[PDB]
Design a protein around this motif. Structure first.
Motif, PDB file in Angstrom:
ATOM      1  N   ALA A  73      -3.013   3.800 -24.654  1.00 18.26           N
ATOM      2  CA  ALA A  73      -3.793   2.822 -23.898  1.00 18.26           C
ATOM      3  C   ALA A  73      -2.989   2.185 -22.756  1.00 18.26           C
ATOM      4  N   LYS A  98     -20.785  -1.892 -27.109  1.00 20.78           N
ATOM      5  CA  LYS A  98     -20.464  -2.873 -28.120  1.00 20.78           C
ATOM      6  C   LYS A  98     -19.279  -3.659 -27.639  1.00 20.78           C
ATOM      7  N   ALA A  99     -18.911  -3.420 -26.388  1.00 21.70           N
ATOM      8  CA  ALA A  99     -17.709  -3.817 -25.697  1.00 21.70           C
ATOM      9  C   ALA A  99     -16.542  -3.017 -26.207  1.00 21.70           C
ATOM     10  N   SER A 139       5.936  -1.098 -42.145  1.00 19.79           N
ATOM     11  CA  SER A 139       6.038  -0.219 -43.323  1.00 19.79           C
ATOM     12  C   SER A 139       6.681  -0.795 -44.593  1.00 19.79           C
ATOM     13  N   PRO A 153       0.809  -1.229   0.000  1.00 20.38           N
ATOM     14  CA  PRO A 153       0.000   0.000   0.000  1.00 20.38           C
ATOM     15  C   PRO A 153       0.842   1.279   0.000  1.00 20.38           C
ATOM     16  N   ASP A 174       0.628   0.420 -27.870  1.00 18.27           N
ATOM     17  CA  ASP A 174       0.356  -0.089 -29.146  1.00 18.27           C
ATOM     18  C   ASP A 174      -1.128   0.069 -29.430  1.00 18.27           C
ATOM     19  N   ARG A 206       3.248  -0.422 -37.816  1.00 21.34           N
ATOM     20  CA  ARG A 206       2.445  -0.534 -39.023  1.00 21.34           C
ATOM     21  C   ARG A 206       3.054  -1.469 -40.085  1.00 21.34           C
ATOM     22  N   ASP A 216     -14.757 -10.671 -26.909  1.00 20.15           N
ATOM     23  CA  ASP A 216     -14.850  -9.251 -26.554  1.00 20.15           C
ATOM     24  C   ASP A 216     -15.159  -8.412 -27.788  1.00 20.15           C
ATOM     25  N   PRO A 217     -15.326  -7.089 -27.655  1.00 20.09           N
ATOM     26  CA  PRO A 217     -15.551  -6.302 -28.869  1.00 20.09           C
ATOM     27  C   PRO A 217     -14.415  -6.591 -29.827  1.00 20.09           C
ATOM     28  N   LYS A 277       3.534   5.552 -40.159  1.00 18.57           N
ATOM     29  CA  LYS A 277       4.388   4.803 -41.043  1.00 18.57           C
ATOM     30  C   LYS A 277       4.229   3.307 -40.744  1.00 18.57           C
TER      31      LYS A 277
END
Lengths: 469, 591, 581
Positions: free
Chosen positions: B236, C407-408, B162, B101, B235, B160, B359-360, C159
């Motif tokens: 929140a 919609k989760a 590239s 704690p 990759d 991404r 999940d969604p 990118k």
């Protein structure tokens, strides 16, 4: 958390199971003993438990405030301490288990050096037998054995207090074994074995009925070399005295040890030093020690509730210790003493210093709607407002040329008639920046994007028509 | 850097050398213990650790991340010394440590909180299925042939990728089922504990990941604690939990409580409270009474060791259109510590039927509870059961019966334990009073389910002059706005007594109850069916016990008896068809 | 030099914010200010900043403001840098976001041009299709193991790859990767595709949405189906590039100091103050609603009132809903609401939902349903076409107008407040005559109970009347000449509407007494002997409240009079006796 089982008839020879019991007391300490000569007589002994009519003098029920009581029975031979009631079955099981303890030392102490020494520990038989009861269960506060050896019949009653011992997971453990009698090793015996032993508590259980025998070393026996200055009687009488126990037992009613208030405060100081160290020096490098954050960490650590008042007793105790500043909001940040890195050496010393000061204090104790028209004039003033908004409506829209309609609409949206009217008045004041050119297809706006809006600001200020129109 | 080379040693020492409490290296004991248990997960009192070496526990604070990597290795070596052959099996052991704690709540975390170890607790929401970790993504492309090699991405981006391999386009990339490492581990939605939520602020779901032994241990509908390291990964923000602790803003205070007890002395505080319950409706003393009652509590209570009976009250509030039958529950919704408003169906989440589903789109597949497990030990608030699909209905009956929710699908097979008390608003089929015919006739729902509901609150009546007066006054008064306990006082209060007190009967004088039970039973058989049942008797008990909690009485008293009896009595009376009029004559003795 | 000119800018700006941000004297607000901002931030230490353009543009004569605006993209680094400078200076894990506000103008979407690129900008618009927030790099630490990894920078444009140069080493490269998830700067992006504001739309070129990514704490500040203003940070995305604006400052802008309404209104502000002076027009108003229709007046009224107020807020519990849902039942079209609703097309926040077959794309993931009609009616035609799906919707709708969505993708409740302009056909055509309305209406189950008012429409020819409407229509059909003109000018109306909202009626005692008697009679009178339709539940009286609120709202007084009361109860009584069939 292994729970070994052996018959004592097989312990009887003592040449087969002797090392094993020492091996398990080195581990499980308290042992599960079973099937001694006493069997149904142990159940028949319950008839003498209903007495509960005696005072203290280390005998009779111990009424302690509340529901808990301990019927202690001092051994008969000792002169001028006796109160006898009935409980003859207890007097029988006293001898019956006297042999059990005299043999238990032979399955324990004899495993080390010789059994010639243990007989001197049992020979006086001065130990008091203990019946125990509860009134019609949190009543058990965690407790450690009075004698060096305690045999006892049991159902459950037992838990495991948090510690580093057998079963280091240190959650409470309640074992229930039919046709079995658990033994509990004494505290001083751990010193006698120089650290080979362990202790275990009780907990909340439906069966209030309990019984024990604490078989105890003679009044005259020293405990090794370390106990030449402390005899078993001294130390073991110390903890049995306190206890309350309760009102008629305050006799004595002064050790360099806490009047416990001091020792608790010590623990606190420990935890405190720890956590302040933690947030301060760690949590952030720059997490400032606010009292409310504080209260959580050690209230946690303690699991006990820490009060600001307790801290004031601490600074009361070591005043050099911590800086504390009530901030606005009235919360008090505490500040460690002035040297950034508090090493563990630091706070070791500090803990020491506090200890000194306390033991010092212990020495000291020992030693002592016209609203409309309003809107009309107001708007009349808002002319100027419009100039200022239009001026610089161009400028905060880094264009200074435009669609007259557009900005007309944005500024409009700030506050159309009024809007167009301003468009007009400004045109009139500044027929330089602004031109309006009717073309076939309509009147095009012309706006000099390079016009100087400061000069235009003062000019708009001065020529409202000098506000004369 | 290699600086830490020294450190690990010292730690291993602390491990080794450590003990306390009559010694007993609890560290050693741990090690040998597993040991053949072969559990490969270590756990360490931060108390001890801090205790021994601060800079240790500190190094945990800041950059626990590598710190553990340092830790686990020397741990493993140590075990190998303890167990030579252990090297072969499991090859690794991960420490869960213990105690830090903090306890950063849920809602309270900042970026400052990120990347550092953090302790927290909360209710298990939908929690993922398991899939093996070893995460790697890769590109087989199209034109540029293959394989573009494995990449490791990302939690959670997968972006991404590239330019690679000839080109990089236009023969651009397509991942292949072959040769891409996956994970499942433990994915858990956890949202802030409803008991503790501050008013108006909604509790926030946060993202929990479980791996290794942690996986699957927990069941949803459970407030657990976890020691995580807050990761903005990636990759929140993803809480990376090292630990899980099974259960285990308004709280009682010494001054407050000491004060409070004094309040508790007076007898009429009951009524005063009943008065305090639903200020706005102007309500009905009775309707309120039930409400207060179930709100207050009961006793669980385990008859050793078989059946615990039920310490709870399933309150059937039988409403009527435009009765505030709506509103009242909302009051409690405000009120209760842990409270779950499930409405009818359709749905006002939760869906009251626990299910584990995908999940969604794309995340590990999270096992979530119905309102019940959520409200376990809390309270379940629902209305329009007539509006409930049988799919739910079975669930309801099941819990009410078993008080536990078993789940076998998909792979996961469990039984969560929902302890929630049932509070229900319902619609007399059609007309307010469907019939003089018994209520079971007068209402839709199945009697078997009904018998489960102890407290049946029926609503009325035919237009009444002065009634219309007093009410309309009340309302009008209200809209015009534009003796009972201070609510907050009450609000801590219930939480408190609930916490502290456990009333207990003395069988001595209580036997009269039985006599009552007969006096009822027989005479009751004469008219009406059944309804009377020993279950109903038990109810009486549990109820008066609630009143004792109200009394904060710790033991049972004839007053609370009078209370309960009057209560249950009346309830039964009200249930019957109009022939209950005849019954009324005998309730006098009951009165 | 460019380095130096821009640095000169930097120093200049630092000087600025450092320089007294505030001249407000005496009672104030005495200086600094921005320092104060910094501190209050340090209070919470949340590491992002908001600032007002206005002061700044002002201070320098805005030559600064200019250079800022123009080169802003270039300027960012020096800016946040100097920020770090002063923070270090006066203050003690470094992330800074600076947000200007109080820009002088507003740019239309279509107004966008390539000249304005890379400079901050001002746009307000209608939000559409928000997206979950996803972490970012800002700066990413990625490099090979040879020889050293996770160099921290860039991946700036989407990118997302890669380490740019000075690889490996000494494997010097090329190579690729390796990315440390241990080291980088996540952010944000939730992004959103926003649409141009509806009213604006030049015929007929039709709306064009654009996308903007929400980075930083401005993230989530957004709400879908909402008018909102943003600071441009405009720039571009490759596609060949496609411009996409970005947003530093998310403002949902788009009541009251009824003055500031007047001040705002100011020009007419003269004119219709007369209207306030004026009287009866509750008639003339009423004599203006749906000029379309002969009679149909009780409706014309009803609409009018529906437009009016009645106040949010209890804090006991429910903020007392001001809104009033209107139901009108009738024998079918020929005007159905085939007339009335369409007419009601002219209004703010006005949602004409043709039919009930949609299916609740309304509230899809804008409440097409509702959040768009927030503070407005969703004129939802043919609830009948709801079939069995929307009754689900009525719940939250009738409840908090919370919009619950999971919609989760997220579990999110979006509150709403939207008037209900609603409709359905009777069962068999006009069934209501003998048949009881309830159950002659059928479908809305309990949501039925959620309806405060209902006007039942049936057509019996007084060939007198028949003739009348006939004429009416005919003239209308005659393109000219229609002198159908509202007793009050309509634009004037909408303006007035603005006024009426401003008033917040009392009163007390008066009517409370008078009313209480009224309900009790209404009430008792209603109940006994026989009864038209149910019930009357008190939620009637609740309506009665709301109703009064509309009536006094008309009075604008703003206070209640037993007169207004009586009126409410009267029209009420009208609808109920209507239920007698």
């Amino acid at each position: 958390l292994r729970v070994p089982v052996i018959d004592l008839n097989r312990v009887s020879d003592e040449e087969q199971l002797l090392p094993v019991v020492r091996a398990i007391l080195l581990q499980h300490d308290t042992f599960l003993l079973k099937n001694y000569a006493n069997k149904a007589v142990l159940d028949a002994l319950l008839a003498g438990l209903t007495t509960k009519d005696l005072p203290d003098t280390s005998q009779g029920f111990d009424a302690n405030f509340v529901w808990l009581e301990q019927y202690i029975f001092d051994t008969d031979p000792q002169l001028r301490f006796d109160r006898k009631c009935r409980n003859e079955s207890l007097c029988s099981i006293y001898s019956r288990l006297f042999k059990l303890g005299l043999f238990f030392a032979q399955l324990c102490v004899k495993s080390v050096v010789s059994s010639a020494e243990l007989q001197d520990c049992i020979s006086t038989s001065h130990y008091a037998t203990k019946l125990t009861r509860y009134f019609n269960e949190r009543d058990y506060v965690t407790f450690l054995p009075t004698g060096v050896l305690t045999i006892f019949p049991c159902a459950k009653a037992i838990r495991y207090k948090p510690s580093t011992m057998a079963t280091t997971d240190n959650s409470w453990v309640s074992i229930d074994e039919p046709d079995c009698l658990l033994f509990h090793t004494g505290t001083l015996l751990a010193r006698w074995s120089q650290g080979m032993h362990t202790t275990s508590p009780l907990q909340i259980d439906p069966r209030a009925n309990i019984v024990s025998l604490t078989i105890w070393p003679p009044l005259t026996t020293p405990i090794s070399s370390k106990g030449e200055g402390t005899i078993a009687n001294h130390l073991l009488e110390q903890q049995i005295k306190a206890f309350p126990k309760v009102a008629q037992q305050y006799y004595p009613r002064s050790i360099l040890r806490l009047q416990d208030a001091m020792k608790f405060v010590k623990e606190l100081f420990t935890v405190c030093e720890t956590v302040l160290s933690l947030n301060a020096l760690s949590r952030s490098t720059g997490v400032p020690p606010e009292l409310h954050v504080l209260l959580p960490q050690i209230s946690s650590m303690m699991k006990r509730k820490i009060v600001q008042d307790d801290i004031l007793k601490l600074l009361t105790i070591w005043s050099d210790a911590y800086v504390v500043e009530l901030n606005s909001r009235g919360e008090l940040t505490m500040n460690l003493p002035k040297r950034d890195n508090l090493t563990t050496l630091t706070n070791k010393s500090r803990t020491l210093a506090f200890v000194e000061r306390a033991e010092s204090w212990y020495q000291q104790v020992i030693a002592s709607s016209q609203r409309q028209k309003r809107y009309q004039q107001f708007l009349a003033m808002k002319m100027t407002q419009v100039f200022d908004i239009l001026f610089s409506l161009t400028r905060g829209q880094p264009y200074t040329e435009t669609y007259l309609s557009s900005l007309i609409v944005d500024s409009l949206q700030d506050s159309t008639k009024e809007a167009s009217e301003i468009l007009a008045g400004l045109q009139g004041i500044l027929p330089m920046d602004i031109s309006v050119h009717q073309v076939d297809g309509g009147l095009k706006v012309y706006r000099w994007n390079s016009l100087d809006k400061n000069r235009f600001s003062k000019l708009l200020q001065i020529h409202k028509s000098k506000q004369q129109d | 850097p290699n600086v830490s080379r020294t450190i690990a040693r010292e730690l291993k020492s602390f491990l080794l050398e450590y003990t306390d409490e009559t010694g007993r290296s609890v560290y050693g004991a741990r090690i040998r213990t597993l040991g053949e248990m072969n559990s490969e997960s270590l756990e360490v009192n931060y108390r001890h650790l801090a205790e021994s070496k601060a800079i240790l526990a500190l190094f945990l604070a800041k950059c626990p991340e590598e710190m553990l990597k340092i830790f686990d290795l020397v741990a493993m070596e140590a075990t190998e010394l303890h167990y030579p052959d252990y090297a072969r099996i499991h090859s690794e052991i991960h420490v869960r440590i213990s105690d830090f704690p903090t306890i950063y709540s849920l809602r309270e975390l900042r970026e400052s909180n990120l990347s550092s170890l953090v302790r927290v607790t909360g209710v298990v929401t939908r929690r993922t299925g398991v899939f093996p970790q070893l995460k790697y993504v890769k590109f087989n492309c199209l034109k540029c042939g293959s394989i573009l090699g494995p990449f490791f991405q990302d939690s959670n981006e997968e972006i991404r990728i590239s330019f690679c391999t000839n080109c990089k386009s236009k023969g651009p990339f397509r991942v292949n089922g072959e040769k891409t490492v996956y994970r499942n581990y433990q994915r858990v939605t956890l949202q802030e504990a409803p008991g503790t939520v501050p008013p108006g602020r909604l509790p926030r779901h946060r993202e929990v990941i479980l791996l290794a032994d942690l996986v699957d241990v927990s069941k949803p509908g459970e407030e657990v604690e976890v020691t995580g390291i807050y990761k903005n990964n990636y990759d929140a923000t993803i809480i990376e939990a090292n630990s899980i602790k099974r259960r285990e803003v308004f709280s009682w205070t010494e001054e407050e409580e000491r004060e409070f007890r004094k309040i508790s002395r007076d007898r009429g505080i009951i009524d005063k409270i009943i008065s305090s319950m639903a200020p706005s409706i102007y309500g009905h003393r009775d309707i309120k009474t039930a409400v207060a009652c179930s709100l207050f509590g009961g006793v669980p209570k385990n008859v050793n060791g078989k059946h615990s009976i039920r310490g709870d009250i399933n309150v059937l509030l039988l409403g009527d259109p435009g009765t505030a039958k709506s509103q009242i529950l909302k009051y409690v919704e405000k009120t209760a510590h842990r409270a779950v408003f499930a409405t009818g169906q359709g749905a006002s989440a939760v869906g009251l039927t626990a299910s584990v589903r995908k999940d969604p789109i794309t995340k590990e597949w999270t096992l979530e509870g119905g309102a019940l497990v959520l409200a376990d030990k809390g309270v379940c608030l629902i209305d329009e059961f007539d509006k409930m699909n049988d799919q739910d209905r079975t669930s309801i009956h099941e819990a009410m019966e078993q008080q536990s929710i078993s789940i076998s699908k998909a792979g996961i097979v469990t039984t969560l334990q929902a302890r929630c008390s049932i509070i229900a608003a319902a619609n007399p089929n059609g007309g307010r009073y469907n019939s003089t015919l018994p209520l079971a006739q007068n209402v839709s729902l199945t009697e078997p389910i009904l018998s489960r509901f102890d407290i049946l609150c029926v609503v009325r009546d035919l237009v009444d002059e002065e009634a219309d007066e007093r009410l309309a006054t009340f309302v009008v008064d209200s809209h015009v706005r534009s003796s009972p306990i201070p609510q907050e006082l009450l609000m801590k209060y219930i939480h408190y007594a609930r916490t502290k007190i456990y009333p207990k009967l003395h069988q001595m004088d209580m036997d009269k109850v039985s006599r009552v039970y007969a006096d009822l039973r027989r005479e009751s058989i004469s008219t009406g069916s059944f309804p009377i049942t020993v279950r109903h008797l038990e109810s009486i008990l549990r109820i008066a016990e609630s009143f004792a909690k109200m009394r904060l009485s710790e033991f049972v008293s004839s007053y609370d008896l009078d209370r309960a009896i009057k209560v249950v009595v009346d309830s039964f009376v009200d249930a019957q068809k109009v022939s209950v009029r005849r019954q009324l004559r005998r309730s006098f003795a009951i009165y | 030099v460019d380095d130096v000119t821009g640095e000169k800018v930097r120093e200049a700006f630092e000087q600025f914010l450092e320089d007294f941000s505030v001249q407000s004297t005496d009672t104030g607000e005495v200086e600094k200010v921005y320092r104060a901002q910094i501190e209050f931030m340090k209070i919470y230490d949340l590491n992002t900043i908001y600032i007002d353009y206005q002061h700044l543009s002002m201070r320098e004569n805005g030559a600064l403001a200019m250079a800022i605006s123009e080169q802003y993209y270039r300027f960012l680094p020096f800016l946040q840098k100097g920020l770090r400078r002063v923070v270090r200076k006066y203050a003690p894990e470094r992330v800074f976001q600076i947000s200007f506000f109080n820009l002088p103008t507003v740019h239309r979407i279509r107004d966008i041009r390539s000249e304005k690129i890379g400079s901050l900008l001002s746009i307000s618009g209608t939000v559409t299709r928000t997206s979950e927030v996803r972490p970012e790099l800002y700066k990413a630490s990625f490099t090979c193991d040879m020889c050293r990894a996770i160099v921290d920078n860039v991946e700036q444009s989407f990118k997302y790859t890669e380490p740019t140069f000075c690889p490996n080493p000494s494997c010097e490269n090329r190579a690729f990767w390796t990315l440390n998830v241990t080291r980088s700067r996540f952010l944000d992006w939730q992004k959103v595709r926003i649409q141009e504001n509806a009213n604006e739309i030049p015929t007929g070129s039709m709306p064009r949405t654009l996308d903007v990514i929400l980075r930083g704490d401005s993230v989530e500040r957004a709400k879908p189906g909402d008018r909102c203003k943003f600071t441009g940070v405009e720039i571009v995305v490759p596609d060949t590039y496609k411009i996409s604006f970005l947003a530093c400052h998310v403002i949902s802008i788009g009541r009251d100091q009824e003055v500031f309404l007047n001040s705002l209104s100011s020009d007419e502000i003269n004119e219709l103050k007369e209207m306030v002076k004026d009287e009866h027009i509750y008639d003339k108003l009423v004599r203006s609603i749906a000029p379309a229709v002969f009679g149909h007046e009780a409706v014309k009224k009803g609409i009018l009132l529906q437009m009016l107020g009645g106040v949010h807020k209890t804090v006991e519990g429910i903020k007392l809903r001001g809104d009033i849902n209107i139901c009108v039942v009738g024998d079918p079209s020929t005007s159905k609401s085939q007339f009335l609703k369409y007419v009601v097309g002219f209004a703010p926040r006005s949602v004409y939902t043709s039919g009930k077959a949609s299916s609740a794309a309304g509230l899809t993931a804008e409440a097409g349903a509702l959040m768009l009609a927030d503070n407005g009616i969703c004129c939802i035609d043919e609830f009948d076409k709801m079939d069995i799906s929307d009754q689900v919707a009525i719940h939250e709708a009738m409840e908090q107008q919370t919009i619950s969505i999971a919609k989760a993708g997220i579990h999110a409740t979006l509150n709403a407040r939207t008037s209900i302009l609603a409709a359905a056909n009777p069962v068999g055509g006009r069934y209501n005559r003998k048949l009881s309305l309830r159950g002659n209406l059928n479908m809305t189950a309990p949501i039925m109970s959620r309806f405060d008012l209902f006007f039942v429409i049936l057509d019996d020819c007084n060939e007198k009347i028949d003739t009348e409407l006939a004429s009416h229509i005919v003239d209308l059909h005659m393109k000219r000449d229609e002198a159908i003109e509202p007793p009050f000018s309509a634009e004037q109306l909408r303006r007035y509407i603005k006024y009426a909202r401003t008033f917040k009626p009392i009163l007390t005692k008066e009517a409370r007494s008078y009313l209480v008697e009224k309900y009790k009679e209404l009430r008792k009178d209603d109940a006994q002997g026989s009864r038209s339709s149910y019930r009357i539940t008190v939620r009637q009286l609740e309506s009665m409240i709301r109703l009064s609120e509309a009536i006094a709202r008309a009075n604008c007084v703003d206070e209640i009079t037993p007169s207004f009361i009586a009126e409410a109860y009267d029209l009420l009584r009208q609808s109920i006796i209507r239920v007698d069939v």
